[PDB]
């Protein structure tokens, strides 16, 4: 159907006129823009496609899919620097969207410009992004065979996300790591930091409890249970509101006395019982377990 050159030119013109016309009415129909750009790509005139993309971008920057499409179009014709430049520009415009960053990252990875992906990753992480960014970065830096500088970013990954989940993840990583010394060291660090910012300026009692538990079980795998015991005492000492903490301690005791376990745990159950309302069962339990002043006072209550 589309045989000779000039005829193809005419076709191109007519099509353009349609597309242009439809853009004129709804300047925003990015579906229409991207379709038009696809047409340009198909025609194998890249410059015009680029222009279309640019115009489209101008019309609405916030539509991420358009950006992605442009990027991939650029990639298609092995015009990699243009893709890269554009992607940098996209990042500059909309850094707080993730998919652009990820698009960049995959591009670079496929390129095997690993240094550049490290560098960019450093940038992205530096902007206090989502936890997701950090995690992906770590995965990259683990997929990268080395295990140094990763440490630094973990340290910074706490700096951006002071969350116990972060710490726990780090610990998990050190578990993969051979040298157990750093595992304990990391634990020491985390605990120290918790101590320093003791007052109500972080996570709840839950996260700290979880941390303490994890530490306790690490030590449990290791030799020094004395230090674990000390930590527990310190923990009960340093922290009030020790339901979680006491629970964990009780569990450890059970693992590693019996009367104590039954006592505190049972008491907790009574507290739990109270929260529910077997209140009779609670009071009775207290009476049996006790202390007896608190049994009869709470009994009266």
């Amino acid at each position: 159907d589309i045989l000779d050159l000039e005829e193809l030119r005419e076709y191109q013109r007519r099509k353009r006129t349609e597309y242009e016309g439809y853009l004129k009415r709804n300047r925003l129909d990015m579906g229409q823009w991207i379709r038009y750009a696809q047409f340009e790509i198909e025609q194998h005139d890249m410059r015009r496609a680029r222009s279309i993309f640019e115009r489209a971008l101008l019309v609405d920057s916030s539509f991420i899919p358009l950006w992605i499409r442009y990027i991939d179009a650029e990639l298609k014709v092995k015009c990699i620097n243009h893709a890269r430049n554009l992607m940098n520009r996209a990042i500059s415009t909309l850094p707080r969207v993730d998919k652009l960053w990820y698009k960049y990252l995959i591009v670079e990875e496929s390129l095997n410009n690993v240094e550049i992906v490290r560098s960019l990753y450093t940038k992205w992480c530096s902007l206090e992004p989502g936890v997701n960014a950090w995690n992906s970065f770590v995965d990259f830096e683990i997929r990268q065979k080395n295990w140094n500088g990763v440490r630094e970013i973990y340290s910074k990954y706490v700096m951006a996300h002071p969350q116990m989940q972060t710490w726990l993840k780090w610990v998990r990583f050190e578990n993969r790591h051979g040298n157990t010394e750093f595992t304990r060291s990391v634990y020491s660090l985390a605990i120290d930091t918790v101590a320093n910012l003791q007052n109500l300026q972080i996570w709840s009692d839950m996260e700290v409890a979880k941390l303490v538990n994890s530490f306790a079980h690490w030590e449990a795998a290791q030799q020094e249970y004395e230090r674990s015991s000390a930590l527990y005492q310190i923990a009960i000492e340093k922290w009030p509101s020790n339901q979680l903490l006491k629970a964990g301690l009780l569990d450890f005791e059970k693992q590693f006395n019996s009367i104590e376990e039954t006592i505190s745990y049972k008491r907790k159950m009574e507290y739990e019982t109270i929260l529910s309302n077997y209140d009779t069962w609670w009071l009775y339990l207290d009476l049996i377990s006790e202390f007896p002043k608190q049994i009869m006072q709470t009994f009266e209550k």
Partner: peptide, 13 residues
């Protein structure tokens, strides 16, 4: 689109 990006990132890796 936060998650779906990272999850698609993970896939193409």
């Amino acid at each position: 689109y936060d998650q779906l990006a990272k999850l698609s990132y993970e896939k193409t890796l």
